[PDB]
């Protein structure tokens, strides 16, 4: 259609918050964030095409050379690989980041694959975006049973009300160049506040987008494969290193996924009118970590 000059249109009032409702109207901000979250869930796209879920598990199983019929018991590494969680995570992350909502984790420490698939997430996304105790627990577990044992470090001596997170107090202990630069990125990863088109925005690095963080990650992990675990047996090491080989083999697909999430997220950030503050929230969103491993 071409429209004449006789025509008209009304402009909305898009003036930002005169009230600063992100300053002690937390029950309303909870409602707002929840509203925006559930609204945002109806617009995240469905993962139209995947790989089948049993033709994968046999490749994984044979890579691990496992006892028969552990598939239905899921020796804890193998739990919750299905969709209905991967899509749930995929939906939750995007809707939460749009609404700026912190998400809590219901995992198990016996399940080390959950801890392994939490790494990619906790690297690519800042840590102040989550809720504190959950990722504190998860990071603590990871540090205590994958990382410090890989160089003979002690387990930890952690404090409840500690100003530093395990990754901060870990950047200085261990001596590796690759991991040093990985942890440098981790510790100094944060959002960028910036006002564009009138609206404030929490923005990514512009290196995260064109995914190369994953190369630092692979460098560290491949190095750790090349190390030994002197204090510990071979089977334990074998299990862990296989758990990350199962991700290594999906590396490039993870890279593409990372770029896709980054692209769609920033694309949708553009389509926001009300300024988007980075503030913790009352209520969270549960996240089984098997739904990350599943997604990955």
């Amino acid at each position: 259609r071409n429209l004449p000059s006789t025509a008209r249109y009304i402009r909305p009032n898009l003036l930002q918050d005169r009230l600063n409702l992100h300053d002690n109207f937390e029950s309303l901000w909870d409602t707002i964030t929840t509203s925006n979250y559930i609204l945002a869930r109806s617009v995240v796209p469905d993962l139209k095409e995947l790989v089948s879920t049993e033709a994968q598990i046999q490749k994984m199983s044979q890579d691990l050379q496992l006892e028969a019929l552990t598939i239905q018991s899921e020796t804890q590494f193998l739990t919750g690989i299905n969709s209905q969680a991967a899509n749930d995570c995929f939906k939750t992350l995007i809707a939460a980041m749009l609404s700026q909502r912190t998400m809590s984790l219901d995992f198990v420490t016996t399940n080390y694959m959950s801890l392994i698939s939490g790494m990619w997430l906790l690297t690519v996304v800042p840590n102040d975006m989550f809720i504190r105790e959950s990722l504190v627990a998860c990071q603590l577990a990871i540090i205590n049973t994958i990382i410090y044992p890989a160089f003979g470090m002690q387990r930890m001596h952690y404090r409840n009300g500690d100003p530093q997170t395990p990754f901060q107090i870990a950047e200085q202990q261990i001596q590796n160049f690759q991991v040093a630069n990985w942890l440098h990125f981790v510790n100094n990863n944060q959002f960028r506040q910036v006002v564009i088109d009138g609206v404030l925005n929490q923005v990514l690095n512009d290196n995260i987008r064109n995914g190369h963080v994953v190369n630092q990650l692979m460098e560290a992990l491949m190095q750790l494969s090349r190390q030994q675990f002197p204090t510990m047996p071979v089977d334990y090491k074998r299990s862990i290193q296989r758990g990350i080989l199962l991700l290594s083999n999906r590396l490039g697909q993870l890279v593409d996924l990372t770029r896709l999430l980054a692209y769609n997220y920033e694309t949708l950030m553009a389509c926001i009118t009300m300024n988007m503050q980075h503030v913790q929230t009352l209520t969270t969103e549960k996240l089984q970590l098997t739904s990350v491993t599943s997604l990955c």
Binding site: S42, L50, S52, A68, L69, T75, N82, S83, Q84
Partner: protein, 1086 residues
């Protein structure tokens, strides 16, 4: 432990006389206690055989009454099998019902007197109203009246239901007592001589009406029953089809707020996506005309129910509609004549004004599809194409029921419909002649069968010779192989055992997209199933013939081509009274090895041909097309957002674009919903069709009184899950009355609760629905060992047939067609193997099963047997139990509702754990031994045989495998590879699953790979014994779930199973003797 009390009360109620005596019989696994049971038994039998009071001893021997296990109860009472009237006079004070002859289209389809339509009994046939079920009206009425008596004193909402059904049964019984009761023969048929002075369509209406009024739980149900019972007495052809018709539009009116998704056949992944509902104006006018017909039929309440919902069009009040949508299919069948049912289809309007540009394209797409299907096997020269004859000759068992023909095996005469036996007959007289394809013409027209399903039309069935199967077999199997991975063949896509349940629509439903869904069930006599379809296939065969170099294959192809030539001109035997019609039908229908997939193809080609015309006026991206038999749907997304005017104009253009090819259609376009035969969606919530008539069947099967009770209960369970819920107690009453057996005029036998719900070949139902029950005791093992000792039986008919000449000829031709010079080492093996597929023949099964029942009966009467150590499941659970530990848990709510019609407890389970995501090889199809079986055959072999076969030495395995048509070289290679040891575990998985209905019923719907179920099941891992840890985890899951179902709360578990017992059990593993009946399974998807 409660069923039997209701049985006792039924016995007391039905007979009521001093002379009516009641005689229990018990058993116990403990010797001393058993001898005291024998003693009690003896004295009781004597007392019974002396007209002495039995009630006195029952206190003295209280121990037996409390701790021993019941089998059955006999009853000696003098009566002349009436008693219904003797009870019924009080319950019949309402008004009887008057017919209305000007309702049904025909004249004889009215409920007028038999003699006014069949004056002579010699021309009488009860088949136009035959209930076709081995259960009496008197049984049904007796059940109803006992139920009514016992539920006469409850005081709750339950009583408000009871008053409602009581009023309905008054309305019914007034009508019945007006004339009287029809009396059953030995076969539960109703002859002329009882119905001679009564209306012809009184029985089915009666039975159907009983079925309806027994399924009333609410006020709206009462309204439905009052509004259907009085109108179903007259309308018998345009009723369930009518009221079930508006639903297809109604699903297109509910805005989606929340959705479910498919990826791979059960990958669920909910979506919060919202979609609006862009309904045009004229479809409301269509609906109004349908409602005008609805009111014109005599309907008052159901327009109101359809009218008051539309004020909001909300989905929370919508299940009422869905409930209503299942009540249409529980009114019965339109059992009209073969002829008149054909003439619903055999009306044709063929015109020389359609395009020619269209049919050539149609034909070409079919041609191209054929080439895509057949490029690889035709080229690489597969053995199964070369030996198509032998392949079909093995797969005869998976064929249709041929026309009856008179055989003779030595010194008997048989009228078998099994086509393998037909071939065996033709082998003797030199008539086995697969190269000479018979014609199908005036000189040899075709018989017919009728595929019925209520609320819809009747489809037809070809009944062919035995060459046609052989011709179509190999090519159609390769086509299926192509179709396993093609998505659009919805009936044939799989992950090697599954059909896609929950559709593939919900990915791309949106405010910008639409969907055209369409019923194609009348498109069998159509002008697009004649010449172009066949000639396209012929052309494809020409291409394929030029795409190969071998000669055997070309012979097969030329024969298949000529088969398509003969199917292009095909006449059809159809009786009408005494004389026979034969009609020109040069087109396609069902009843063939090729028809299903080929119809899917043909509909696909047709819709692909139609679909190139919306493109003249709209830009869309075809996201999905789907075809499954009698329907098809395609979704499409636009460059912009949708309006009413575009749907309307698209709809008119679609209708006219079908009209350009002379093709009728009720075109249906929507944005959110569909309706098809087997399922339907509204607002992102899956509903299902609950249409299985219980007291009226489709056709006359071959099962006993026994097994039909089990199938009916399976169908009950299914319909319950669908939404249509009937009172379970009535069903239990029917089960006891149908397994009850009359040994004399006054002797009648009644089995017990612990026989029908116990894992065996005789299991019928469960004490708690959706839960198989096991045995922690000695006694269930004890009787199971006994019944397993009795399950293995013989068929003298089979023995003498296998000793005839035709069998020898058959073996000889098999041999010399495959191999020679091992005439006494393998050929005997092959005869034993052919025996494994003679058992498909029904009279053998009847001989064997009636023998099984007689052997069963001679130990139901008398005491019990120790059965000699044969291990079963309940032994294992008995031994597993003392290493458990329970703890109270508390689970949260984290799963979304998407099947509202379920009971709320079932939904609570679903609302706390997940829905299933895989489907295990219940028949072991992905097993590498089965990927050989799927290479040389299609045959199943049952898991009894497989579970045994793997347990044997390395010698008889070779004989058994070579005997199945397999050559010797690959079998030797298979034995050397040692993949069967890699298949013990898969087979055992399938074995235990089939034994325990894990892929059959409610447990078929559950995710055992869940993380939520697993955290309660804290069984640590040990390793190097897979069977034990598998079974332990499974049984613990079932324990927690059963505790949840019956009590709601959750628990965790722990099992420190000792290695000593691991080792003691490892040897008890592969000597199990157990079995479950095929007839007991309840597939939610049929």
């Amino acid at each position: 432990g409660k069923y039997n009390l209701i049985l006792s009360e039924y016995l007391s109620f039905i007979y009521n006389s001093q002379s009516a005596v009641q005689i229990p019989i018990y058993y116990s696994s403990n010797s001393e206690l058993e001898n005291r049971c024998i003693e009690f038994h003896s004295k009781c039998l004597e007392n019974s055989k002396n007209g002495l009071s039995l009630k006195k001893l029952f206190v003295e021997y209280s121990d037996v009454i409390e701790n021993a296990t019941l089998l059955s109860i006999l009853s000696y009472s003098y009566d002349k099998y009436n008693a219904v009237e003797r009870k019924l006079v009080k319950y019949a004070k309402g008004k009887p019902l008057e017919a209305d002859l000007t309702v049904n289209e025909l004249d004889y389809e009215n409920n007028k007197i038999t003699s006014e339509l069949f004056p002579t009994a010699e021309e009488y046939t009860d088949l136009l109203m035959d209930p076709a079920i081995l259960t009496s009206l008197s049984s049904n009425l007796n059940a109803v009246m006992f139920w009514l008596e016992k539920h006469e004193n409850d005081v709750a909402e339950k009583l408000k239901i009871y008053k409602r059904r009581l009023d309905l049964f008054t309305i019914v019984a007034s009508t019945v007592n007006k004339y009287g009761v029809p009396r059953h023969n030995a076969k539960y048929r109703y002859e002329y001589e009882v119905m001679k002075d009564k209306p012809y369509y009184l029985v089915t209406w009666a039975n159907s009406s009983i079925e309806m009024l027994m399924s009333v739980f609410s006020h709206e149900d009462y309204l439905i029953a009052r509004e259907l019972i009085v109108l179903s007495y007259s309308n018998r052809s345009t009723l369930a089809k009518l009221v079930s018709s508006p639903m297809s539009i109604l699903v297109a009116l509910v805005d989606i707020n929340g959705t479910f998704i498919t990826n791979e056949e059960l990958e669920l992944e909910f979506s919060n996506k919202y979609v609006r509902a862009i309904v045009p104006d004229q479809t409301f006018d269509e609906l109004k005309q349908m409602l005008d017909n609805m009111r014109k039929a005599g309907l008052t309440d159901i327009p109101k129910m359809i009218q008051d919902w539309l004020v909001d069009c909300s989905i929370e009040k919508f299940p009422l509609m869905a409930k209503i949508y299942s009540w249409s299919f529980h009114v019965g069948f339109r059992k009209q004549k073969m002829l008149d049912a054909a003439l619903d289809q055999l009306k044709t309007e063929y015109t020389e004004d359609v395009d020619d540009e269209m049919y050539r394209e149609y034909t070409m797409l079919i041609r191209d599809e054929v080439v895509k299907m057949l490029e690889e096997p035709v080229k690489h020269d597969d053995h199964l194409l070369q030996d198509s004859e032998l392949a079909g000759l093995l797969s005869m068992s998976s064929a249709s029921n041929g026309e009856s023909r008179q055989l003779k095996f030595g010194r008997k005469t048989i009228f078998s419909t099994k086509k393998n036996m037909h071939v065996m007959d033709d082998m003797a007289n030199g008539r086995y002649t697969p190269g000479i394809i018979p014609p199908v013409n005036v000189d040899k027209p075709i018989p017919l069968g009728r595929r019925d399903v209520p609320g819809r039309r009747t489809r037809i069935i070809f009944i062919l010779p035995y060459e046609y199967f052989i011709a179509q077999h190999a090519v159609v199997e390769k086509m299926l192989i192509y179709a396993k991975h093609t998505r659009e063949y919805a009936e044939f896509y799989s992950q090697s055992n599954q059909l896609l349940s929950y559709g593939d629509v919900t990915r791309f439903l949106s405010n910008n997209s639409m969907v055209l869904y369409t019923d194609v069930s009348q498109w069998d006599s159509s002008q697009h199933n004649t010449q172009p379809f066949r000639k396209g296939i012929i052309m494809g065969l020409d291409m394929l013939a030029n795409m190969t170099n071998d000669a055997r294959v070309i012979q097969t192809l030329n024969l298949y081509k000529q088969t398509q030539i003969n199917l292009m001109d095909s006449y059809v035997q159809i009786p009408d009274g005494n004389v026979i019609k034969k009609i020109q039908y040069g087109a396609v229908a069902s009843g063939e090895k090729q028809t299903k997939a080929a119809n899917s193809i043909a509909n696909l080609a047709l819709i692909k041909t139609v679909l190139s015309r919306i493109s003249n006026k709209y830009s869309f991206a075809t996201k999905i097309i789907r075809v499954d038999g009698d329907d098809n749907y395609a979704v499409l997304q636009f460059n912009t957002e949708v309006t009413k005017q575009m749907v309307q104009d698209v709809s008119n253009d679609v209708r006219e674009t079908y009209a350009r090819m002379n093709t009728k259609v009720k075109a249906l376009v929507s944005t959110v919903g569909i309706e098809i035969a087997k399922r339907y969606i509204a607002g992102g919530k899956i509903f299902f069709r609950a249409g299985i008539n219980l007291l009226n069947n489709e056709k006359k099967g071959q099962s006993t009184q026994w097994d039909q009770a089990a199938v009916l209960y399976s169908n009950y369970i299914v319909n319950r899950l669908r939404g249509f819920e009937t009172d379970r107690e009535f069903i239990l009453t029917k089960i006891m009355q149908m397994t009850s057996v009359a040994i004399t005029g006054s002797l009648r036998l009644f089995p017990s609760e612990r026989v029908l719900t116990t894992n065996s070949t005789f299991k019928v139902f469960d004490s708690e629905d959706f839960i198989i029950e096991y045995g922690t005791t000695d006694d269930e093992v004890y009787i199971q060992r006994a019944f397993m000792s009795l399950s293995s039986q013989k068929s003298g008919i089979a023995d003498e047939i296998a000793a005839s000449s035709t069998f020898k000829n058959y073996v000889s031709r098999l041999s010399e067609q495959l191999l020679f010079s091992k005439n006494n080492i393998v050929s005997r093996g092959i005869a034993l193997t052919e025996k494994a597929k003679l058992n498909s023949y029904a009279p053998i099964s009847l001989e064997k099963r009636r023998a099984q029942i007689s052997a069963l009966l001679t130990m139901l009467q008398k005491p019990v047997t120790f059965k000699s150590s044969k291990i079963t499941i309940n032994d294992i659970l008995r031994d597993i139990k003392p290493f458990f530990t329970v703890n109270e848990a508390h689970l949260p709510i984290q799963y979304q509702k998407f099947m509202p019609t379920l009971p709320d407890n079932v939904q609570y389970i679903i609302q706390c754990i997940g829905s299933r995501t895989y489907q295990i090889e219940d028949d072991g199809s992905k097993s590498a031994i089965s990927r050989l079986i799927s290479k040389y055959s299609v045959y199943k072999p049952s898991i009894e045989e497989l579970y045994k076969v793997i347990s044997l030495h390395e010698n008889e395995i070779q004989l058994y495998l070579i005997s199945l048509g397999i050559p010797k070289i690959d079998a030797d290679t298979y034995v050397g590879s040692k993949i069967y040891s890699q298949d013990k575990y898969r087979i055992l998985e399938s074995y235990v699953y089939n034994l325990l209905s894990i892929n059959y019923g409610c447990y078929q719907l559950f995710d055992f790979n869940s993380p939520d179920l697993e955290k309660l099941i804290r069984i640590p891992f040990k390793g190097k014994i897979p069977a034990v840890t598998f079974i332990l985890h499974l049984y613990a899951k079932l324990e927690v779930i059963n505790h949840a179902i019956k009590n709601g709360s959750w628990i965790s578990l722990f099992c420190n199973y000792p290695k000593s017992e691991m080792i003691k059990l490892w040897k008890k593993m592969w000597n199990i003797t157990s079995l479950r009946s095929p007839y007991t399974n309840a597939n939610f998807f049929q």
